[PDB]
Amino acid sequence: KFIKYLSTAHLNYMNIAVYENGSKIKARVENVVNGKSVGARDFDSTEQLESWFYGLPGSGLGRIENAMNEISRREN
Amino acid sequence: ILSTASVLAFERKLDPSDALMSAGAWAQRDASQEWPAVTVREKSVRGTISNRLKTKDRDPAKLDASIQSPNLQTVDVANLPSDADTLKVRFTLRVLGGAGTPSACNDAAYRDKLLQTVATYVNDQGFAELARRYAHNLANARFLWRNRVGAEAVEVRINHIRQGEVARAWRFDALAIGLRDFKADAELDALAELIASGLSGSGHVLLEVVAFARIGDGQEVFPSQELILDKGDKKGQKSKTLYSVRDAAAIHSQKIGNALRTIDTWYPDEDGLGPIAVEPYGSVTSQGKAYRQPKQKLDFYTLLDNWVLRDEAPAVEQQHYVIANLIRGGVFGE
Amino acid sequence: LSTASVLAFERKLDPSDALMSAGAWAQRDASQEWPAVTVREKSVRGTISNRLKTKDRDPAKLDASIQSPNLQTVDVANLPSDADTLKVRFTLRVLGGAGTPSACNDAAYRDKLLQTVATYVNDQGFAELARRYAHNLANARFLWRNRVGAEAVEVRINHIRQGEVARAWRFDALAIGLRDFKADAELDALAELIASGLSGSGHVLLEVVAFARIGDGQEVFPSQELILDKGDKKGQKSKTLYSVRDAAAIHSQKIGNALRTIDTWYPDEDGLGPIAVEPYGSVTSQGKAYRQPKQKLDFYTLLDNWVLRDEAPAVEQQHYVIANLIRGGVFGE
């Protein structure tokens, strides 16, 4: 079910994990030591994941901070 | 029933400081007290395209179009002055001692069992092995990480301090002393008796470490690099900052502390590569590998649980590993 | 045996920033107290010569454009009016050990890489690459535009073991060609020194000093810095120049660009000349990228076909691949 981590360096114990559900993938912002997640977002394929992710404003870990601030957004 | 303590925390011993770098001339080496500092400055750089492509869209017109718009960039460098060929790196080091007592623990029986285990270790054999390997890491120049690579002569001077004075001075030669072979010496046995007398709590140990390296006239020194993160915001900022103190380049303290605790020659996988530093789940961040897996029985948590709770004493060298992790300190427990 | 996902090679042949100081020819052997070339400002009012959209039958916009031309402030560096010789000094370390990466995931791929590079060195030495490096130190590639239009260029190279000089070389850069790598006894000696340096058989530190007759009060050409638009014209909107403490200078990576012009093995045309060694071997000024990945001469393609599959390429392409390992870089995914 688990595929990979989205970033290669943890920014204060937090990282985005990429999961697989069948015909869709599940990106999920989560703590690493504990395991409990803070927000999630469902995509259809990994091409949508990389195509959406590489369009974010930033480079390196500013991109992963913007992605964690995007997936774990206050929904209301 | 003796479960583990849910809260454990060990304060570190062997506390270093931030190393300062100042440049000067060799054979003006004994008067290295008024040397000016190495400053961090800016310069501009125009890169190109050299990264690996992808076999989904790599057209020749897109490559030439990529070369039409290159990367303009601003970095920080630190160089010696053009009339100086010697790097001076100075830091200090305290050796605290009392390396068995935690700073926070829930249980009282588990803490007393832990102190009986550590006191049993010290009474069976001293701190001579660990202080011998620490003395070898102060002997050569591990704490000169990339500055050591490609140098004519590296000289290390170590002082012991009791008051506003100097008790005993050592002067070594870092290139003659090996990088991988821990061979004995009289002076290293003296300084290993000093550090081993420090970790046992039999006195106060403050050391002053000064390192000298011939690099070349106007060459480049290598301070430690700071964290930025480009969030796509204004101005196209700097892509390489360097750590500094008040107008001097410097190295972080935890990187020197990484260079001092490279003890572990007891990997299950391969003892042919060399000693890499002491960690629970003993890992190397640059190599991307994690030696000493928990699927084996050589992890720090597994050996500590099997040696405190169940009295199953491991081999002697693994006991050196466990006590090395207690001198490292950390946040243990659940 | 897949490729390692992380590869990184530290560079060898590490230069420094070159300093420029001006003086008089035939006072050339005492070139030790010469004053530095300083960077100063001057004002420049420029007209409009942009390629306008043609068939513009509106001269009122043209005569309107002359009412406010470009008021501009630039930096120049000139020799003093009683000096006609440019002195450019820098140093150079030759490290050696050009096969071992600094970061690698796999252990089998790294051992296969070290067997491949050690196989290359045991089959043939570093004599070719050190011969071409010796030719780029022989002439004055590192004098980029300062070389163009000069009466006589003299290069002095010193080897340093202690606070001393082991062996000194004195060349003539205009007699030595720009495109023809012809042998010589002294270039074979210095090529033995560099080849002895890259193999790890010793420590090599060189001091390179270059001399050029340009003219009294002419213009020298330091390297140019990057300007962000937070500064106005009075505030150098136009043209800043790189400097050190009150002296004009050249960046270190530009001299490092001038040293590694080896590649005479393009598939397209060997008639133009050697341009420097890059993966996807490209020229930024010409806007072209030789050595395309659609061919089979790229560095990544040759390295994958020569490490993983034991398909050894031609000998000159092996010189190209080892030249990219001496260059260093960030490889892998």
Added chain:
Amino acid sequence: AQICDEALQYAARLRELEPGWSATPGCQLHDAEQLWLDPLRAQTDETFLQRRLRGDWPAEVGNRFANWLNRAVSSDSQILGSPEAAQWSQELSKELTMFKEILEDERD
């Protein structure tokens, strides 16, 4: 249309509210946006005010505004291989054209 017309509302709210635009730091990159947000003339202005910024029809802020729109919304390249970015680029072409066409008479 609502984004660029909303930017016209931003220059609207900036225009008739804060008439104080005196000297301060940063007058090189905020100098084209200063001539875009043309304030009232100073009371100590001499006769050299009908030539200092009279010919200032600032069509460069449609270019900076174009870069802000390009960095704001994602421009897909799979729509670039199709005609969605030729028709889309036509939409931003004529819309920024009409925006600058409003900007033609900011002073005159």
